[PDB]
């Protein structure tokens, strides 16, 4: 499930084989409202 690691970076190339491994191992280098309507509420109160 190592392809899930790609979402943590910008996905540079990758895809075929060993590119994902080299990139995952080299990525460590960089590290309606009614508001205000008193009349409606007065009607609802009754």
């Amino acid at each position: 499930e190592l392809k899930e690691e790609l979402e943590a970076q910008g996905l540079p190339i990758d895809g075929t084989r060993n590119v994902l491994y080299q990139r995952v191992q080299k990525a460590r280098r960089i590290n309606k409202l009614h508001e205000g309507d008193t009349e409606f509420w007065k009607r609802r109160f009754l």
């Binding site: 009614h34 508001e35 205000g36 008193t38 509420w41 609802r44 109160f45």
Partner: protein, 49 residues
């Protein structure tokens, strides 16, 4: 959920506090009346307020 802008909070707080004061005085008065103690409601209402 029924009332929004402060009528939700104002009326809710008013209803809760009004009910609390009635029961708080009643419970204290009932305890003292059971022992024959006679205290005016004014003194308890000062504390409950």
């Amino acid at each position: 959920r029924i009332l929004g802008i402060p009528w939700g909070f104002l009326i809710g707080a008013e209803l809760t506090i009004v009910q609390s004061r009635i029961s708080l005085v009643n419970k204290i008065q009932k305890v003292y009346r059971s022992q024959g103690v006679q205290i005016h409601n004014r003194h308890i209402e000062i504390i409950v307020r």
